């Protein structure tokens, strides 16, 4: 008995299950909702969800829209990668940002470049929360596909593949561990956000993204433990 091989075969069958579960969930979503959308930050599970949507043909007729929130404080690498996935999968993201401000220089002029330090709650409202809420209303989203997973822990620990509400939320990767997301990216040789190679399991704004030791990434709730 080759122990390593037997363990690999079990994880192979695990990932086939998890892929089927995600795909079935996404197919049910496209069939049952008129205006589904996915807010995408280009982190590892988000890249998995892009690839799964591509697989079921969700981009061919713009059935599923991709939402991208430009906070004006993302890594340069994140904008470059967004362009690459747009080209790879044939969609253009619907970009939302701080209200009435076209770019970071305009944002700095209106609000001050150091708002994130002096009042983080105002910064969050202006650059993250209001644009996301406006994106969902503008696009009349009736099902929000998202990368929340149970292995995020705390208030996400008991999510299922669907969550009830006036707007339905859809978690195709509810049961995937972070490690399963990475096995998928490896199995299909998919490009991922380059900052994952520089020790960041999760990637957000430059001022608030911190690296995490690699031995911690695959513990329960490890992905977002930087913050």
């Amino acid at each position: 008995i080759d122990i390593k091989k037997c363990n690999e075969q079990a994880r192979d069958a695990r990932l086939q299950h998890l892929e089927a579960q995600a795909l079935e969930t996404l197919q049910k979503t496209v069939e049952n909702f008129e205006k589904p959308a996915f807010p995408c930050a280009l982190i590892a599970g988000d890249v998995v969800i892009l690839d799964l949507l591509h697989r079921i043909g969700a981009f061919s007729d713009n059935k599923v829209k991709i939402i991208f929130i430009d906070t004006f404080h993302l890594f340069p690498e994140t904008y470059k990668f967004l362009s690459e996935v747009e080209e790879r999968y044939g969609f253009k993201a619907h970009v939302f940002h701080a209200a009435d401000v076209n770019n970071k220089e305009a944002y700095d002029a209106k609000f001050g470049s150091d708002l994130f330090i002096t009042d983080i709650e105002e910064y969050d409202r202006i650059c993250k929360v209001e644009p996301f809420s406006r994106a969902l209303k503008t696009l009349e989203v009736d099902a929000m596909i998202n990368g929340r997973r149970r292995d995020h822990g705390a208030e996400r620990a008991h999510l299922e593949v669907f969550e009830e509400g006036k707007m339905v939320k859809v978690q195709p990767l509810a049961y995937w561990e972070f490690r399963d997301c990475w096995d998928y990216l490896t199995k299909y040789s998919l490009p991922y956000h380059p900052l994952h190679d520089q020790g960041f399991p999760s990637i957000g704004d430059v001022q608030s993204t911190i690296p995490v030791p690699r031995e911690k990434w695959f513990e329960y709730a490890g992905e977002r433990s930087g913050r």
Copy 2:
């Protein structure tokens, strides 16, 4: 779209996957090892494993031995439940206990009834660790089936379905959450240890078994959190 029904169907497919993984693991064990054994404490995952061994015919062929460690400090309910599963599935457990003492009264005479209070390390050695070690040696066990799961956390977090060693260890339920074990018991209407109904997620010796609020049982590492 009926959200509850869709969630239930996904978990149904999840449990069918987990069942196949556990069954295949157990079948590969019986096929590749001469003296497989399962130390069984009759907690919820242990009851699942008994049923799965039954389903692959492991008791008809006498292919797998059940080991039961009688610490002499177990609940009365535990001895009763052992007799019930023995009869249900058609096996007799191989019972090991403290060396050279036939029963609790003989144990009390040799070691003192209050040893668990006055020297817990000696108590553990005498009633738990040495009998288990002696069980494995006496029965020449070459593959130890067990109920360790990844959702036990800490040093168990990265277990796979097999673990390498001079004696192989087999974790059929490695990827099952506690919740998945309970869903199995419910699906097949299987009797479980009555003390689970008094608020104990895990059940051992009377002096060391602690109840845990039900709402905490299904958190990561919840089953054994009484300690």
